[PDB]
C-alpha cells in the first residue's frame, strides 16, 4: 500500500532528475544554428508510375534492396510483387487471412513476410525449386495483431505486435529468440538502424523506445509526442530518427542528445501522420497524412517545401528507394504511385 | 534479351488472368463485422447464423462472411479501422444483463462517430429478451436504478408487440431502442444507417434479417451514385 507510493515517489524523482539533465544538455536550438544554411527551394515531384491491380485498401509496402522490385499488401488478401520499371506484376501471392496489416521484403530478395489480425507472421519463399510461392514458415506466439515486421537477414526477423511487445524470431527454428517488453500500448511501427544492432519502436503510449537487438534491453525512451505514434524512421546515419503521431505533428529525436530537436507542424494540419521516411541525404522528410496528401519537409529548416497530391483516399504507406531514386506511396484507394 | 522481357509480359498476363477470377469472387461475397459487447450471447448468435474467427453462411445464393475478433486486447481504436469497408457491423447488446448497457451505449457512440466508420452501417441486435421479460416481471432490478429517465417514458404508438409479453417489457425494450436511436439520430456528420432488431436465443430467423438489412444498405449505396 504505502510501499507502492514510495516506488511512485522514487519514479517521479528519477523523472525529474532525467528532465533536469536533459535541460542541462540543451544549450542551443537546432532552429538557431541552421538559420544560415540555404533553403532547398521547392520540390516538384510528379507521378511517374501508377500500379493497379489491388481490390481493397493497401496497408503495407516495401522496396527491395535492388531498388527495382516492390511489394504491397492489400486487405482483399493479396501480396503483390511488382516490377516498378516496367509496371509488370512479378508475383501475386494469396494469403490465408484477408486482414494483413504489414509486409516486408528480405534484403536478399528471397523471402517475403506478412502478418495481420491473425497474430501470425507468415514467411514465403520466392525462389522455390521451379515451383510456386509457398508459405515457408508461420511464426506464432504473439497475443495481439501484428503491426510491423522487418528482416535482419534471411534467418532473423523482428516483429511489433498489438500486445505491447516486440519479438526477435529465428525463422529456421521457429520460436522467439528475444522479447522486448516495456511499452504500455500497441506497438505500431518499428525501424531498423543502418547497422543491425539497434532499432526504435513507437507505440500508442505516445513514447518511442530504443532497443538493442543482441542484448535485448531498452536503452532510451523518448516522450515528446502527446498522442499515439503511427510512424517511425531512422535518419540515414543512425544517430537520430523521426516520428509521426495523431497530434498532427512530426518530430525529430536524437540518440546521443537523448531529446527532440525539431517539430514539424502547421496550423491547417489537424490530421495525423500515417507514415514518415527520409531521403538518401536526410535533408527531406516525407510524411503521409489522413487528408489524402503527402508533405515534404526541410528536415533542417523545418519549413515545408512540397506537396504530393495524387491519392483519393487516406495515404497509408510511403517509402523511399534505397538509392533515393523514387518515392512509392500507397493509399486506401487501392493504388500505388511512384513519384520522382 | 527481349525474350526475358516477353517472358515477364507472359507472367504478368497469367497473373492478371488469375486476378480477374479472384476479382469476380471478391465482389460476390459480403463481409460483416460481428462486434458484440461481451457476455451478450454473440457466441449463441454465431451458433445460429486464433486472432480472428470467421463464419460463412449463405442466404438466397448470396454468401456472407462474418468475422469475430478473438485474441485481441480491450483497446480497439487501432485494429477497428480495418473494418471501414465492411458492409455492416452487427452490434449485439445484452438488453437484460447490465452497467453493461451504458458500456454498450458508449461503444456504439464511439463507433457511430468515428471518422473512418462514418459511412459504415450498424445492424443492432438487442439480445436477451427472455431474461429481460422475466426480470421486468420479477422486478429484481429496475432500469430506473441505472437510467432515471426510464420513468416518465411513454411507449410509442407504432410497432405492436407480440401478445404474450407484459406491456412493461415492451416499455423497457423500446426505451433501450430509443436510447440507441438517440445516438444514431443526432450526429448527422457522415452517411450511414442503423437497423435495430429484437433477437433471442430461441430465435431462428436472424439470417433473413441480416439479408434484408444488407439488401437495403446496398440499395441505398447504389442510390447515391445518381446524385452528384
Amino acid at each position, epitope marked *: 500500500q504505502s510501499e507502492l507510493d514510495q516506488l511512485r515517489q522514487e519514479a517521479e524523482q528519477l523523472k525529474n532528475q532525467i528532465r533536469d539533465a536533459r535541460k542541462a544538455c540543451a544549450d542551443a536550438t537546432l532552429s538557431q544554428i541552421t538559420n544560415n544554411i540555404d533553403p532547398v527551394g521547392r520540390i516538384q515531384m510528379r507521378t511517374r508510375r501508377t500500379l493497379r491491380g489491388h481490390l481493397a485498401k493497401i496497408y503495407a509496402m516495401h522496396w527491395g534492396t535492388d531498388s527495382r522490385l516492390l511489394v504491397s499488401a492489400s486487405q482483399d488478401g493479396k501480396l503483390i510483387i511488382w516490377d516498378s520499371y516496367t509496371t509488370n506484376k512479378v508475383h501475386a501471392i494469396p494469403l490465408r487471412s484477408s486482414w494483413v496489416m504489414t509486409c516486408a521484403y528480405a534484403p536478399s530478395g528471397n523471402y517475403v513476410a506478412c502478418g495481420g489480425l491473425d497474430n501470425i507472421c507468415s514467411i514465403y519463399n520466392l525462389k522455390t525449386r521451379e515451383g510456386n510461392v509457398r508459405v515457408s514458415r508461420e511464426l506464432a506466439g504473439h497475443t495481439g495483431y501484428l503491426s510491423c515486421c522487418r528482416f535482419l537477414d534471411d534467418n532473423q526477423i523482428v516483429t511489433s505486435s498489438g500486445d505491447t511487445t516486440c519479438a526477435l524470431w529465428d525463422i529456421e527454428t521457429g520460436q522467439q529468440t528475444t522479447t522486448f517488453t516495456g511499452h504500455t500500448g500497441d506497438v505500431m511501427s518499428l525501424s531498423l538502424a543502418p547497422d543491425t544492432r539497434l532499432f526504435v519502436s513507437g507505440a500508442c503510449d505516445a513514447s518511442a523506445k530504443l532497443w538493442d537487438v543482441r542484448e535485448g534491453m531498452c536503452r532510451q525512451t523518448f516522450t515528446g509526442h502527446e498522442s499515439d505514434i503511427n510512424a517511425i524512421c531512422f535518419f540515414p546515419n543512425g544517430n537520430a530518427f523521426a516520428t509521426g503521431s495523431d497530434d498532427a505533428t512530426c518530430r525529430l529525436f536524437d540518440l546521443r542528445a537523448d531529446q527532440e530537436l525539431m517539430t514539424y507542424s502547421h496550423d491547417n494540419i489537424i490530421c495525423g501522420i500515417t507514415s514518415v521516411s527520409f531521403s538518401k541525404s536526410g535533408r527531406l522528410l516525407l510524411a503521409g497524412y489522413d487528408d489524402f496528401n503527402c508533405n515534404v519537409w526541410d528536415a533542417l529548416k523545418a519549413d515545408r517545401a512540397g506537396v504530393l497530391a495524387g491519392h483519393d483516399n487516406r495515404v497509408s504507406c510511403l517509402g523511399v528507394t534505397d538509392d533515393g531514386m523514387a518515392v512509392a506511396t500507397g493509399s486506401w484507394d487501392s493504388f500505388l504511385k511512384i513519384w520522382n | 534479351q527481349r525474350n526475358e522481357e516477353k517472358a515477364q509480359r507472359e507472367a504478368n498476363k497469367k497473373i492478371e488472368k488469375q486476378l480477374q477470377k479472384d476479382k469476380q469472387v471478391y465482389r460476390a461475397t459480403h463481409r460483416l463485422l460481428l462486434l458484440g459487447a461481451g457476455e451478450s450471447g454473440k457466441n449463441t448468435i454465431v451458433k445460429q447464423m486464433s486472432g480472428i474467427f470467421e463464419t460463412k453462411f449463405q442466404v438466397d445464393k448470396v454468401n456472407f462472411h462474418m468475422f469475430d475478433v478473438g485474441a485481441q486486447r480491450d*483497446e480497439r481504436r487501432k485494429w477497428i479501422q480495418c473494418f471501414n469497408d465492411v458492409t455492416a457491423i452487427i452490434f449485439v447488446v445484452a438488453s437484460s444483463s447490465y452497467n453493461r448497457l451504458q458500456a454498450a451505449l458508449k461503444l456504439f457512440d464511439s463507433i457511430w462517430n468515428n471518422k473512418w466508420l462514418r459511412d459504415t452501417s450498424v445492424i443492432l441486435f438487442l439480445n436477451k429478451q427472455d431474461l429481460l421479460a422475466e426480470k421486468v416481471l420479477a422486478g429484481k432490478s429496475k432500469i430506473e436504478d441505472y437510467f432515471p429517465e426510464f420513468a416518465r417514458y411513454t411507449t410509442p404508438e407504432d410497432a405492436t408487440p407480440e401478445p404474450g409479453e407484459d406491456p412493461r417489457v415492451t416499455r423497457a425494450k423500446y426505451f433501450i431502442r430509443d436510447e440507441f436511436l438517440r445516438i444514431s439520430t443526432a450526429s448527422g456528420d457522415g452517411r450511414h444507417y442503423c437497423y435495430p432488431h429484437f433477437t433471442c436465443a430461441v430465435d431462428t430467423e436472424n439470417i433473413r434479417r441480416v439479408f434484408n438489412d444488407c439488401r437495403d444498405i446496398i440499395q441505398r449505396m447504389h442510390l447515391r451514385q445518381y446524385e452528384l
Partner: nanobody
Amino acid sequence: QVQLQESGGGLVQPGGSLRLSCAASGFTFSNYKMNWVRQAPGKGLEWVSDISQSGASISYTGSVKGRFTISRDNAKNTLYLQMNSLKPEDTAVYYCARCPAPFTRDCFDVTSTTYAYRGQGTQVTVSS
C-alpha cells in the same frame, strides 16, 4: 510526457459534498475531450462523465445525473468534478481520462484497465 494528476479525494459522510480536480500537463488541454471514470472495489472501470473541448457538450451516466457536475477551465488546463449528495454506493477510485486523439468526437478506450492517458486516481470513500 502526458501527465494527469488528480486531487481532492477523501472520506465523506453520506450526503456530503466533494470537488475533485485534475491538472494536466504535456498536451494542449483545449483540443481534447475530457472524461471522469471510476472503479468500484471489486468491479471494473466504468464511465462517469465527460465534457467536450469548449464545455458546451456535457454528458453524465444515469447513476450520477442530477448530483454531479463536471467543468473545465482552459485558462489553467484544469478539470473539475463537483460531487453533491454522495451516497455509500459512490465509494470508488476516480480517474481523469483524456480522449485518445485531438479534435475528434469519439473516445474509444478510456476504460480499458491499461489506458495510457489516464491518471492515478483518488480514493473517494463514503461511510459513517
